[PDB]
Amino acid sequence: NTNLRTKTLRDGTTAEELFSQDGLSFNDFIILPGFIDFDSSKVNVSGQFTKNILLHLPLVSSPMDTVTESSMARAMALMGGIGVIHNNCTVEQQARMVRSV
Amino acid sequence: GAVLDKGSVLKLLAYIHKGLQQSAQDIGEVSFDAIREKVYEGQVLFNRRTLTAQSE
Amino acid sequence: NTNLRTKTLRDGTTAEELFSQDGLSFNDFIILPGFIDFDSSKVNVSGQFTKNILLHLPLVSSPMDTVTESSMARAMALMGGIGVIHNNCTVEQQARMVRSVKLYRNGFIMKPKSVSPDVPVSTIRNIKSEKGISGILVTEGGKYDGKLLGIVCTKDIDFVKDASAPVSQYMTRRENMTVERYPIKLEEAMDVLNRSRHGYLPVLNDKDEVVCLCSRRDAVRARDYPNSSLDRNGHLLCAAATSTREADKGRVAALSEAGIDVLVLDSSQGNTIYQVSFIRWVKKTYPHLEVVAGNVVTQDQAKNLIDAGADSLRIGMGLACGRPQATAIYKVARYAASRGVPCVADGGLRNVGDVCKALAVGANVAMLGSMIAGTSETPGEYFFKDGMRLKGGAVLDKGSVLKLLAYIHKGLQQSAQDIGEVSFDAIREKVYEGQVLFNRRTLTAQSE
Amino acid sequence: NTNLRTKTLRDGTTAEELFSQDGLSFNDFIILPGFIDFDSSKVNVSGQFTKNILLHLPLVSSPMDTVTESSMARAMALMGGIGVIHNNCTVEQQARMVRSVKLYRNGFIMKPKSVSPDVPVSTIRNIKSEKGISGILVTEGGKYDGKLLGIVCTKDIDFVKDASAPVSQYMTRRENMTVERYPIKLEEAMDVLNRSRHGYLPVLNDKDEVVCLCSRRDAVRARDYPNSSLDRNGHLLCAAATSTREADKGRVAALSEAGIDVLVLDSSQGNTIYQVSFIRWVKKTYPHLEVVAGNVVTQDQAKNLIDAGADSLRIGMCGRPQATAIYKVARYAASRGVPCVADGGLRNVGDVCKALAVGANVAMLGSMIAGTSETPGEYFFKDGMRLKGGAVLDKGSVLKLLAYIHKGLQQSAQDIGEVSFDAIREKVYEGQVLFNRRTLTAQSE
Numbered sequence A: 001n002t003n004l005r006t007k008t009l010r011d012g013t014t015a016e017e018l019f020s021q022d023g024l025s026f027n028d029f030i031i032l033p034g035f036i037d038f039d040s041s042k043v044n045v046s047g048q049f050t051k052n053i054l055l056h057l058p059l060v061s062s063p064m065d066t067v068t069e070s071s072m073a074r075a076m077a078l079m080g081g082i083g084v085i086h087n088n089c090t091v092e093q094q095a096r097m098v099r100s101v
Numbered sequence B: 001g002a003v004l005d006k007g008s009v010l011k012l013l014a015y016i017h018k019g020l021q022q023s024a025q026d027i028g029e030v031s032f033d034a035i036r037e038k039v040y041e042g043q044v045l046f047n048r049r050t051l052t053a054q055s056e
Numbered sequence C: 001n002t003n004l005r006t007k008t009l010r011d012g013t014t015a016e017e018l019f020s021q022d023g024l025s026f027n028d029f030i031i032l033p034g035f036i037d038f039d040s041s042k043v044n045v046s047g048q049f050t051k052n053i054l055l056h057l058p059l060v061s062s063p064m065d066t067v068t069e070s071s072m073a074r075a076m077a078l079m080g081g082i083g084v085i086h087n088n089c090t091v092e093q094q095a096r097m098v099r100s101v102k103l104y105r106n107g108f109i110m111k112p113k114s115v116s117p118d119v120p121v122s123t124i125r126n127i128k129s130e131k132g133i134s135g136i137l138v139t140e141g142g143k144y145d146g147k148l149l150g151i152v153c154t155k156d157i158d159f160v161k162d163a164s165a166p167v168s169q170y171m172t173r174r175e176n177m178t179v180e181r182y183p184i185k186l187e188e189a190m191d192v193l194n195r196s197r198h199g200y201l202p203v204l205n206d207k208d209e210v211v212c213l214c215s216r217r218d219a220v221r222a223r224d225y226p227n228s229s230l231d232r233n234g235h236l237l238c239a240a241a242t243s244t245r246e247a248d249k250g251r252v253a254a255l256s257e258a259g260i261d262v263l264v265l266d267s268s269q270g271n272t273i274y275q276v277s278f279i280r281w282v283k284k285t286y287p288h289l290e291v292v293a294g295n296v297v298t299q300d301q302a303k304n305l306i307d308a309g310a311d312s313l314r315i316g317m318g319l320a321c322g323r324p325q326a327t328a329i330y331k332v333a334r335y336a337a338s339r340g341v342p343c344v345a346d347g348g349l350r351n352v353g354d355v356c357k358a359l360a361v362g363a364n365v366a367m368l369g370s371m372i373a374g375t376s377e378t379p380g381e382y383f384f385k386d387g388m389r390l391k392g393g394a395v396l397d398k399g400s401v402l403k404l405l406a407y408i409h410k411g412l413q414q415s416a417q418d419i420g421e422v423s424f425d426a427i428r429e430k431v432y433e434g435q436v437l438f439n440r441r442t443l444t445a446q447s448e
Numbered sequence D: 001n002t003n004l005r006t007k008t009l010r011d012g013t014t015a016e017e018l019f020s021q022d023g024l025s026f027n028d029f030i031i032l033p034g035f036i037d038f039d040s041s042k043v044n045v046s047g048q049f050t051k052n053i054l055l056h057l058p059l060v061s062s063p064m065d066t067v068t069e070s071s072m073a074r075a076m077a078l079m080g081g082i083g084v085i086h087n088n089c090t091v092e093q094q095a096r097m098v099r100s101v102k103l104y105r106n107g108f109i110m111k112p113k114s115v116s117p118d119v120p121v122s123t124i125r126n127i128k129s130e131k132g133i134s135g136i137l138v139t140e141g142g143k144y145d146g147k148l149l150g151i152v153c154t155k156d157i158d159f160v161k162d163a164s165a166p167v168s169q170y171m172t173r174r175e176n177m178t179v180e181r182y183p184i185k186l187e188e189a190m191d192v193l194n195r196s197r198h199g200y201l202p203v204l205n206d207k208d209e210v211v212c213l214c215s216r217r218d219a220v221r222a223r224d225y226p227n228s229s230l231d232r233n234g235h236l237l238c239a240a241a242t243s244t245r246e247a248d249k250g251r252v253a254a255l256s257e258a259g260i261d262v263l264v265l266d267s268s269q270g271n272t273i274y275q276v277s278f279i280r281w282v283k284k285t286y287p288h289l290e291v292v293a294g295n296v297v298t299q300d301q302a303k304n305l306i307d308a309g310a311d312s313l314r315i316g317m318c319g320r321p322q323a324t325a326i327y328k329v330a331r332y333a334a335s336r337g338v339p340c341v342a343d344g345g346l347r348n349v350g351d352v353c354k355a356l357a358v359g360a361n362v363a364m365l366g367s368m369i370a371g372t373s374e375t376p377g378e379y380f381f382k383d384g385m386r387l388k389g390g391a392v393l394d395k396g397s398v399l400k401l402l403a404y405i406h407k408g409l410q411q412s413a414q415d416i417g418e419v420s421f422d423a424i425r426e427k428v429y430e431g432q433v434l435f436n437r438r439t440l441t442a443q444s445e
């Protein structure tokens, strides 16, 4: 299907051009649609958290004392993402939370 | 310093997950690795919206 | 007057230049005035719905379950536009609605509604409430092509109290009826029916069997609505929507039998292998049907669907705030125009100003959704709340769509007059030519 | 079911007690529920407009030029209410409007619209477009009582291309017409008409001159609108407004001759010598007319106008609170056999019900029906809204709206536990229908 998927007319702004001026918000632009020959269930959303770690789910929980402790970090990793235990606590507390995950 | 209950994060993650897939489907690539690549390649394209185009 | 009309100074932005940057809304710009040497009444607002269909009125009703069913589709076609029957219903229901639009206006009525003499008066009173017709023929066996016994009309049964009485008791019987013999020209049949001062004229063969029927209503409809959108057979035009699943192949056949003229593909993004496969299949299997592909918003999408053989394209949305409709329409319509394919503007039309802009920047016709919801001819039940009359997720009553269409119509003419061209075909041409010019408005210029 | 319907515990406030203090709006109280042993459809909402006129539908269209000209008055009367032709117009205009209402529905149409054979089709199309009538008779010299030559109907001229042609060519000639001979009882002529499958039946004298006419349309309107408000001649009822100046004595004569059944006095405050005098004059001069005095808001005003010979009173018009005003004035006037019209403060069906329950026989609608199809003015568009022209939204046909208010009153009466509003009014005074005042906190949901 490469003939149908690849653009020749290329009607739209390229990213290099889009960001070549003002500082933009996400609201300042939209992504133009392409060509579909597959069910959305087959889409691979994975991404590299780090050079050697690939998250199946490109989601990381923020390291805030109101969001990520042992319980959240567990949930994130189970779903394919990861958690970052906040550092607003004693060294003993934070390590206790890591062991717990 | 108070926020609404949003249920289990497990349900919320699966909702985000399903949302990413529908969006990447709209763009027309079967992975975000490919979307990133083709953004740089100039095959995935954008449109800047005017401010009044953003109000509708 | 060409010397006075054609611009040399050309003070204003060209369209190619206007849309060369940001994605624009219709509000982001205005069309600069031209030169006027004609009354607005003479303006030709027509546009191509598809390659072979030209709408006198560049208006299409949206295929939503809240806007277009049989009643609306009738109204649109009568005024010179067209309707697209929504696809949120069984195949049987949707086809029932198509037949209902096609057979509303006839030349010769081929399968006239018939009943037997046994049938009670009550039954005929139900037919005028449901189908909306009279002049029901009473034939042998109820067969629509049986021996003609009589005819039932309004003044025959309005005074009757016992609704159980057979029709034979109150019908006008064959001996007293004025009929005609087949074959006869339609031109003559209607002159006979007119001079006859009756509302109906059966046409029979040698054995007094019913061949067809003429209605005087189809004479006045031809008179009160001289711009109606008709097919070769004098029947109103009717489009219908459909998805592009394999299952929907069966739905297309049904609609084809019911006699739609245009197939509108229903998709929020039509640049799919499915839609492409589907279009190819329709054109191969049903060559007589024109197909409106979509929705699309880019030239790249548009290329694929025109390749597959689309006769038209829907531009717009209908996740997800997408490509600004003004830009989308300009870009796609221009591309498609080169491939000889017209475009339908489908989204972002809040008022008449917007519709005019959408047609000037390249759309041949505009699809109306919200702008006509709440009119008499839309599906829904009327009700009251807080002294307001509503329809049903509830909208205000807007009277008959027929009045509203004529208001849009008059509005397009005044606008095209301001621009200074006697047709929207010419405005589109001269937009591309760089003779009709625009001005982008600043945001504060838009606040006054 | 008396042992169930009659209250002995009597948990609630009587009206006499409820209105014994400060002036109440309709929102200040509610009517406590009763006992139900009947379907709502069986409820009789009728009320006395004047002493001798009982409206099936206790609703009157206001005499405002925004609301009631000829078209509205018809619609009201057909549904069982009545219209009051406004007076912001010439005497000539106002009587012309009255005639349109009276001569709309007939039994026998006297003075049929008739034309000469020389007249072009163009004229028949204009009579059809303006006055809305068809079945135009063709007679000698166009005299409504001339020798009958033919009849012109829609199917005779809808197909004609040359609008200047004389009706003679396309009319149905007297030779081919089904007629009848005078005298003939109406109910028999209407039977011939139904049997003939025609839309019109002229009745002639011995010399083939037109005495009167029968319209099949009038037979459908008796079938479709069985509760139409009619006089003793089968015409729709019609009221018209007038002020009480000397100048207006002329106006009353014109309106009386046009055929009004009820005169409605237009005054911001009716307790004036001018109205007292005027009422006496109308009664000495035109005793066949019922008069509606007002507006008034106190018993003291009511006495003077009732003394003068009023047959009804407008209650309303910043001022005295309307719920109190209706109660205080209506109770007094009831004791003297005079019914009252509620004219003010009616924003919804709920208000209407309360107004009628606390003593008004009929209500006068103004704003609540402004913007309906039948009100004067033209429609126009703006901002995706349909409007009339100071502007109001399209409310559709008033006929649908009136049926809504009707069913609304029936539902309300059912909750209160009585099968008629006469009953409710009676039992309010008797203390068997009870209310409850509401705190301002209890009003805010």
Ligand SMILES: Nc1ncnc2c1ncn2[C@@H]1O[C@H](COP(=O)(O)OP(=O)(O)OP(=O)(O)O)[C@@H](O)[C@H]1O
Pocket (backbone or CB within 6 Å): C134, C135, C151, C152, C153, C154, C155, C156, C171, C172, C176, C177, C178, C179, C197, C198, C199, C200, C201, C202, D155, D197
């Ligand atoms: N072809 C015909 N020949 C003779 N009489 C007819 C014919 N068609 C209808 N009629 C009679 O004419 C009378 C009604 O006339 P007409 O058909 O003009 O009424 P109409 O208002 O057009 O009916 P509808 O409103 O139901 O269409 C009836 O008695 C009917 O039987």
Ligand SMILES: Nc1ncnc2c1ncn2[C@@H]1O[C@H](COP(=O)(O)OP(=O)(O)OP(=O)(O)O)[C@@H](O)[C@H]1O
Pocket (backbone or CB within 6 Å): C155, C197, D134, D135, D151, D152, D153, D154, D155, D156, D171, D172, D176, D177, D178, D179, D197, D198, D199, D200, D201, D202
């Ligand atoms: N009294 C009559 N005798 C004979 N023919 C009549 C009579 N009245 C009307 N007609 C004829 O009937 C035809 C018109 O149809 P009809 O009378 O059934 O009602 P109509 O045309 O629907 O009435 P309207 O003009 O109010 O619409 C014409 O040909 C007319 O000449």
Ligand SMILES: Nc1nc2c(ncn2[C@@H]2O[C@H](COP(=O)(O)O)[C@@H](O)[C@H]2O)c(=O)[nH]1
Pocket (backbone or CB within 6 Å): C103, C104, C109, C110, C111, C112, C113, C114, C131, C133, C134, C135, C136, C137, C213, C215
């Ligand atoms: N007798 C009669 N039949 C009509 C008229 N108009 C349409 N028809 C026919 O009535 C049929 C519609 O009824 P259905 O088939 O839906 O029961 C179609 O065959 C249509 O052509 C009319 O005015 N009179």
Ligand SMILES: Nc1nc2c(ncn2[C@@H]2O[C@H](COP(=O)(O)O)[C@@H](O)[C@H]2O)c(=O)[nH]1
Pocket (backbone or CB within 6 Å): D103, D104, D109, D110, D111, D112, D113, D114, D131, D133, D134, D135, D136, D137, D213, D215
């Ligand atoms: N021919 C005819 N006359 C009517 C009909 N209905 C009312 N009229 C009469 O037409 C006349 C109209 O009065 P005008 O408006 O001309 O003063 C009145 O005499 C009225 O009674 C109708 O259906 N046909």
